[PDB]
Amino acid sequence: MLKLNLKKSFQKDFDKLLLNGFDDSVLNEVILTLRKKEPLDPQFQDHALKGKWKPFRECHIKPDVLLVYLVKDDELILLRLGSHSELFLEG
């Protein structure tokens, strides 16, 4: 499988979510699927980001919990985990 690369930005987001009650079970399943280069099912709204954010992709773990990630050179890079406002609106 791909090697995981958790950026520090992702670690901080994850630790903040945990303190706010986040359950990471679905996240873990999504991560494994991505590491195996398999497609996510339709609920995850998996897609490529545009503009500034290329070449990253985004999927929805929950409606206010988005995962921003990239497959590059044998890694799955996990960049951010949080709300649309936190990730994209400087929140």
Resolution, Å (one decimal): 1.3
60 is a catalytic site residue: no
Residues 48/60/65/31 CA torsion (nearest 10 deg): -90
CB 91 within 8 A of CB 79: no
Mention every residue, 6+ apart, whose C-beta is less than 8 A from residue 46.
39, 40, 57, 58, 59
Q: What are phi and psi of 85, to 5 degrees?
A: -65, -40
Neighbours of 2 (CB within 10 A): 16
At residue 28, what is the residue type? N
Residue 84 marked as a ligand binder:
yes
- Spot the catalytic one: 84, 85, 86, 90: 84
Domains and CATH numbers, the chain: 1-91 (3.30.2310.20)
CB 6 within 8 A of CB 28: no
